[PDB]
Amino acid sequence: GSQTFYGINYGVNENSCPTVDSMKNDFNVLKPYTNRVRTFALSVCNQASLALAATQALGMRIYLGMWIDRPDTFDNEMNALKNILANNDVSNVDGLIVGSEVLYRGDTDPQSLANYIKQVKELVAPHGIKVATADVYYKFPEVVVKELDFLMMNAFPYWEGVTIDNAADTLMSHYDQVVGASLGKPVKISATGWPSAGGNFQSSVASVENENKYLHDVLCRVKQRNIDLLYFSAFDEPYRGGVEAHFGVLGSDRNTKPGITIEAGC
Numbered sequence: 549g550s551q552t553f554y555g556i557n558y559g560v561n562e563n564s565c566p567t568v569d570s571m572k573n574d575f576n577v578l579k580p581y582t583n584r585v586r587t588f589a590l591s592v593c594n595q596a597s598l599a600l601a602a603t604q605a606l607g608m609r610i611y612l613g614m615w616i617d618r619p620d621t622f623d624n625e626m627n628a629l630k631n632i633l634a635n636n637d638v639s640n641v642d643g644l645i646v647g648s649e650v651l652y653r654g655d656t657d658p659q660s661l662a663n664y665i666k667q668v669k670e671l672v673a674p675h676g677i678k679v680a681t682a683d684v685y686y687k688f689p690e691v692v693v694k695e696l697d698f699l700m701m702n703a704f705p706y707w708e709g710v711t712i713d714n715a716a717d718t719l720m721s722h723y724d725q726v727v728g729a730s731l732g733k734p735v736k737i738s739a740t741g742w743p744s745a746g747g748n749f750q751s752s753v754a755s756v757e758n759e760n761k762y763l764h765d766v767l768c769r770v771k772q773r774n775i776d777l778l779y780f781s782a783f784d785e786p787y788r789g790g791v792e793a794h795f796g797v798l799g800s801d802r803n804t805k806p807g808i809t810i811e812a813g814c
């Protein structure tokens with residue numbers, strides 16, 4: 549069952565950082581289901597350096613995310629990238645994800661993002677690392693895509709008000725649009741998921757039974773079409789409040805969630 553998930557998203561609490569030994573215990577819970585994890589920032593909590601050490605000791609692999617937001621984060625993260633290359637073995641890195649939903653939020657303009665991606669590529673290419681960015685299905689303009697090695701989609705049919713029976717179909721439909729803007733380059737999925745509690749969003753109902761169905765349906769759909777997927781997410785994060793606190797495959801205390809069975813729908 550170690551090949552059920554291609555990979556899983558791993559959240560970090562910025563107000564209460566983990567340690568190397570802490571991450572190792574966390575990744576051991578996931579090891580029967582997966583061999584890959586993904587982190588969202590480099591310098592915050594020194595998480596990249598610690599996750600590189602944790603995964604390498606357990607024979608697992610990793611996607612490294614760069615968190616770019618306000619003007620400061622461009623310089624701050626680039627300097628942290630430089631330090632990783634000088635201080636760490638990076639042979640188990642499957643890719644570097646420059647920003648998550650940068651264009652959706654309106655943090656910078658398409659040309660500025662395109663230029664920043666080029667600087668990153670010039671640095672990591674000699675180490676044989678591939679570059680991407682992650683955003684919503686309708687935010688992949690040609691100027692950005694030209695600088696990429698591959699594309700990564702974030703899509704959540706729950707926030708769109710789509711019913712559970714149609715949810716996986718909509719995801720695949722959104723995937724086709726990204727391919728339409730891909731210029732022929734590989735397209736992966738960096739985040740999708742479904743909440744187990746917190747109420748509803750229009751016709752989208754949050755329940756344990758619905759998260760279980762969504763998990764099964766999405767895993768089948770990606771296996772049929774040979775799409776690489778990073779599922780969202782590993783553990784429930786209570787410090788996020790409401791709906792955002794129930795996206796985990798397993799519980800916040802690291803035990804399993806009753807009603808969730810970890811398997812693909814086909």
Ligand SMILES: OC[C@H]1O[C@@H](O[C@@H]2[C@@H](O)[C@H](O[C@@H]3[C@@H](O)[C@H](O)O[C@H](CO)[C@H]3O)O[C@H](CO)[C@H]2O)[C@H](O)[C@@H](O)[C@@H]1O
Pocket residue numbers: 558559560562588589592615648702704739785792
């Ligand atoms: O740790 C670095 C950085 O983390 C930021 O919080 C991120 C969230 O932005 C992210 O949000 C998810 C989206 O990426 C995804 O598309 O949708 C889901 C469901 O709506 C979102 O939860 O989640 C990750 C993992 O929990 C967080 O690390 C902080 O905002 C930022 O302050 C911090 O620097």
